[PDB]
Design a protein around this ligand. Sequence first.
Ligand SMILES: [Mg+2]
Ligand SMILES: [Mg+2]
Ligand SMILES: [Mg+2]
Ligand SMILES: [Mg+2]
Ligand SMILES: [Mg+2]
Ligand SMILES: [Mg+2]
Ligand SMILES: [Mg+2]
Ligand SMILES: [Mg+2]
Ligand SMILES: [Mg+2]
Ligand SMILES: [Mg+2]
Ligand SMILES: [Mg+2]
Ligand SMILES: [Mg+2]
Ligand SMILES: [Mg+2]
Ligand SMILES: [Mg+2]
Ligand SMILES: [Mg+2]
Ligand SMILES: [Mg+2]
Ligand SMILES: [Mg+2]
Ligand SMILES: [Mg+2]
Ligand SMILES: [Mg+2]
Ligand SMILES: [Mg+2]
Ligand SMILES: [Mg+2]
Ligand SMILES: [Mg+2]
Ligand SMILES: [Mg+2]
Ligand SMILES: [Mg+2]
Ligand SMILES: [Mg+2]
Ligand SMILES: [Mg+2]
Ligand SMILES: [Mg+2]
Ligand SMILES: [Mg+2]
Lengths: 205, 122, 211, 156
Amino acid sequence: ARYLGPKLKLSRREGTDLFLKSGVRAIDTKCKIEQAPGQHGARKPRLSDYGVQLREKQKVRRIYGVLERQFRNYYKEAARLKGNTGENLLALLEGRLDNVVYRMGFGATRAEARQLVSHKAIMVNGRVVNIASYQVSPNDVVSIREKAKKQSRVKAALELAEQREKPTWLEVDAGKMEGTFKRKPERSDLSADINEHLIVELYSK
Amino acid sequence: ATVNQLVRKPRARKVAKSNVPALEACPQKRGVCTRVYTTTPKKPNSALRKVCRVRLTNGFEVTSYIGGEGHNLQEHSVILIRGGRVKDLPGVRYHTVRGALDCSGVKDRKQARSKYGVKRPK
Amino acid sequence: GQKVHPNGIRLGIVKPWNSTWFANTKEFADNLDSDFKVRQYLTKELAKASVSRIVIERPAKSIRVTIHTARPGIVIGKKGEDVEKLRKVVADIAGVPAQINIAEVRKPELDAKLVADSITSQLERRVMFRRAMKRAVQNAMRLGAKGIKVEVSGRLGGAEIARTEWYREGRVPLHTLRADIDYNTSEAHTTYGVIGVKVWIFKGEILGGMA
Amino acid sequence: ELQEKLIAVNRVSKTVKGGRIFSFTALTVVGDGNGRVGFGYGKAREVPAAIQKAMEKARRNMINVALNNGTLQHPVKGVHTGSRVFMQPASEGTGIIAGGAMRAVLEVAGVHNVLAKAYGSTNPINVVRATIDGLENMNSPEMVAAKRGKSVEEIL
RNA sequence: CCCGCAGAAGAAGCACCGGCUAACUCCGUGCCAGCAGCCGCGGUAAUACGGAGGGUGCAAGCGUUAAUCGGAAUUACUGGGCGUAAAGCGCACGCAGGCGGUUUGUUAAGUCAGAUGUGAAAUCCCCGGGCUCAACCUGGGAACUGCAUCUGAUACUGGCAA
RNA sequence: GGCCGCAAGGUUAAAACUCAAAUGAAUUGACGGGGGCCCGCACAAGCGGUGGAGCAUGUGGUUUAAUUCGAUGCAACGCGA
RNA sequence: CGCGGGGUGGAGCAGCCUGGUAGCUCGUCGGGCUCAUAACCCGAAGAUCGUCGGUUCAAAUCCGGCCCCCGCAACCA
Ligand SMILES: [Mg+2]
Ligand SMILES: [Mg+2]
Ligand SMILES: [Mg+2]
Ligand SMILES: [Mg+2]
Ligand SMILES: [Mg+2]
Ligand SMILES: [Mg+2]
Ligand SMILES: [Mg+2]
Ligand SMILES: [Mg+2]
Ligand SMILES: [Mg+2]
Ligand SMILES: [Mg+2]
Ligand SMILES: [Mg+2]
Ligand SMILES: [Mg+2]
Ligand SMILES: [Mg+2]
Ligand SMILES: [Mg+2]
Ligand SMILES: [Mg+2]
Ligand SMILES: [Mg+2]
Ligand SMILES: [Mg+2]
Ligand SMILES: [Mg+2]
Ligand SMILES: [Mg+2]
Ligand SMILES: [Mg+2]
Ligand SMILES: [Mg+2]
Ligand SMILES: [Mg+2]
Ligand SMILES: [Mg+2]
Ligand SMILES: [Mg+2]
Ligand SMILES: [Mg+2]
Ligand SMILES: [Mg+2]
Ligand SMILES: [Mg+2]
Ligand SMILES: [Mg+2]
C-alpha cells in the first residue's frame, strides 16, 4: 500500500519540493534537487502532452500519499459532486484526516501524521479514528489523546508547523493539542503551483 | 439511406468472426502434441521456429508456437495452449503456455519469468 | 569536380609566400628540408598558442622566423624565457643563427587557420559539428568578413557512413583571382577516425594588386 | 505575452535527378489567450529554420474570437478538406477535452472548457484550419442582437 | 469492541523502458538464438534478442489469454455515401406502397395541453442516516422516457364536403 | 440451391481460407522504338591514320621457386613507374 | 571573504518568469518643416543581451563558471 522507498527520489523525479521531509534542512542540502534520479538524471528529456498530464497527476498523488485506486475513486466522487471538478478533488484530498493532522501540526511529515493516526493517537469528536483516509467534516474537533500527548515528536512537529505558513481554514490550539476544522479549504487557500486541468483531462480521456 | 428504405430493410450488423475458433470462447485449452518440429518463417525474416501440431480435447487439430529458448516437449505430451498468432508463420494462431501441464519453464530466465513460467530464484 | 587550392592559385597575385628567400640549386633542397623541420617543430611546440602562419626569411647567413599568432602573451611567456628557448632550438635545427619575431593577429575569428583549428579542437572535445560550424560562421560574419564557407567531412558523430556538410554565408568568389580568399584546412583525430575541416574566408577584393 | 506551441514537424522529400532532397515542415499555433489565435505553416531544409518561419507566419495573420467567460458561446461546427469538427460550450471546470491539434489550438486561443470531437480525417493541418474556421464562424449575443436590430434582453 | 505485554520486531511483488506509450546504458550473441498487439527488430558497436545496473507504472496484487461495448461517423435514426476511390438497374411503362398546388367549412384520427389509473420491490440518480472510514446497509424523494381512460386546443398532417 | 434458357449460358448469390494493404487525384525526378527546339570533329565535306608487316611498350592468359602489388566499360592497358 | 541583487545600441529604461518574437524615450545623421534656431513630422544609423562555457531542433531568457558593479558583512587606533 504505502510507498516505502526513498522520498527525495520522488521529489527529484517530479522536480519540485513535495515536503516529504520535516524541513529542518534545505532539500538542496539533503539531495541534488535539480537533477533527476538515476544514471541518466542529468539528461532532461522533452515531455509530451501525456507525459506532462501523467507528471501532474503523479505529483499530487506523491504529495498526499494516495495510490491509484483510491485516487481514481476520489476523482469519480469529485466528478459526481456538483461544482468544479478539480476544486472538489483538491477539497477531498484536503479533507483526508492525515492531511488535516499535518496541517494542524501534529506531524513533521504527512507520513508521520499517518503514523500517529494509524497508531491510534487521534480523536475526532471524542472518537478514536484509525483510518488515514477518514474524511473530516466541517466543525469537527480533532485532538491528540492523552496517551500520545507525552510524545516529544508531536511537540517538535508543532514547532515545525509554527515555522510553516498557517492555514486559514483551520484553528488549532497547541496547548490543548486540538484543532477545529472550520471549513473546506478554497482553491485560493490551496497551492497555486498545482494544476488541476491536467488531472481532469487525464482521467477524462 | 432513406428512412422509408430503412423501414423496408434495416441495417444488418456486420458479424465479425473470431480469429481463434479452436478455443471456442475459452481462455486456454488442453491438447496432446501430435508432432513437434521446426518451420521456416515468412519472407523478410529467418529462423527455425518451434511449432507443435496438437490434437485438442474438442477434436480440433491445430498448430501452436513454442515460445522461449529451448523446450522439453515431444510426441504424446499433454500441453496447454492459448490464443495469439506469430504473424510470420502461416497458419499458427496459438501459443503454448510455458509452466503448464507437462511443459517446463524456460531455463535461466530472470525477466518475464511470469510469462515463461519461471519460479523466483533465491 | 576537383577545385584548385585557393592560396596556390593566388600566389603572386594577391597572396605572399610563406618562405621568402633566394637560393641556388645547390642549397635549394637542404633549405626546404630545414624549413620543413622548423615549421614542424614550431607547430608541435605552440599547438596550444594558436599559431596562424610561420614565415621563414633567410639572409645569406641567418634564419629569421616570424610567427603570426593570436595570443603573443602565452608564446613569449615570462619576459624572454620561452622565445629564447624556441630561438636556441630552431638555431640548432637550422644550423644557423636564428632570430624569431612574433606578429599579433588582432582578429582570430577572421583567420581561416585559427578558425579551422578551433573547430577541430571542438570536434575532438566531442561537441556537435553543426553547432561548432554555425558558431564559427556567425562569429566571422559578425566580425565583418565579406563571406565565409566552412566544410566538415567524414564520419560525423561517429556515423558509419561518411558525409560532407558545409555552410556558406555572404559571398566567397573562388574564381575571382583578385579576391582575398583566406583558406586553410585541419584534421580532427576523433575516436572514430579523421574528420577534415576546410574554411574559406572572403575578406575583400584588392584592386591595386600589390602582389 | 503571446503563447505559442509547435503541433507537428513532418519530413518531406523532393526526389531530384541526383537523389532525394529532404526538408522539414513545421505547423505552429500562436495566441494571446485573451481570444486572438493564429496558425502558421513553414518549410525549410532544417527543423529550426522551419519552426522559426512557421512562428513568424503564425504571429502574422491572427483572428479575433468572441469568447464567453473562457469558453464558447454556442455549439459550432467546422469543415475543411477532410476535417469535420464539432465543438460545444462545456461548463466551467470540465477542462478542454479535445484531440491533439484541436487541443493545441483551443489552449492557445484561451478557451478553458469545451467538448470537442474531430470527425472525418484527422490530418493536423486540415483539422487546425477547420477548428480556426469554426471559431471564426461563431457570433456573440451582442453581434446577433445588433444584426437582428434588437436588444440583448430580447435575445437572451 | 475495549484494556495490558513485548519488541521494528512477523509481512513486496509483478509488468514494462524503439514509436504508438511514462521510463536508457553496458555486456553476451551475429538474419543464429530469439522477440512481436501494429509498424517492425536480429547479417559484429542491437536504447526492440538474452543478462546486469538504473528507471517507469501498478501494488497484495501484477501480467497473459478469452469475451462485450467503446474508440468505429467502420450499418451513419441522432450521424455516411454512389462522375473518376466500393456504389445509379441498359431503358421505359406501371399495380401495391411512399409523397401531395391553393381557399373555405367540418371532424378531432395523428399532434399538443391538463387530469386520473397504472408503470412491483430491489437496482440507477439526489438529499440524509448507521456500521471508527470505505465497500456495505438503510429513510425519503426523483426517475421508470411507457400504456390506458377522461377533459380540452384546432396551427400543421389525415378524413369528409364544396 | 432456386428461376429462366433448345443450348451457349443468364439472373439471384455466399463461405472457409489468405494479405495489410488494394485504390483515387495530384507532386518532384528518371525513362519512352512520344513531340518540338538547340549545341558539341556528333554526323556530313575533307586530310591523315589504326586494323595487314617487322620491331618497341603495356595488359590478359599460360608458365614458373618467384614471374611483387595496384589500375582493368567510356573514365584500365607507353597507367602508379 | 560571508549573503543577496544586478550587468540589454552612447545614456536612461522593456523584454527574463511561460525557450522561438531584441522594444520604448533621450541622444546622432539626413530630409521635410522654420528666413534660420527652436519646436514638429518622416525616415536612416547604433547592443550582440558583461564574458567563458553547459543544455536543447532552437538560449537576452534555462544551468554553471569567470569577470566586474551595487547592497548588505562582523575589524580598526
Ligand atoms: Mg583538377
Ligand atoms: Mg477515416
Ligand atoms: Mg517515451
Ligand atoms: Mg520483451
Ligand atoms: Mg552489442
Ligand atoms: Mg531487451
Ligand atoms: Mg480483447
Ligand atoms: Mg457505432
Ligand atoms: Mg464513407
Ligand atoms: Mg477503376
Ligand atoms: Mg468505381
Ligand atoms: Mg444510366
Ligand atoms: Mg395540402
Ligand atoms: Mg394519401
Ligand atoms: Mg385526438
Ligand atoms: Mg421500481
Ligand atoms: Mg457516515
Ligand atoms: Mg434507497
Ligand atoms: Mg384539419
Ligand atoms: Mg384539412
Ligand atoms: Mg446458378
Ligand atoms: Mg572543336
Ligand atoms: Mg566520318
Ligand atoms: Mg597488329
Ligand atoms: Mg585483357
Ligand atoms: Mg598483376
Ligand atoms: Mg587484381
Ligand atoms: Mg595512355
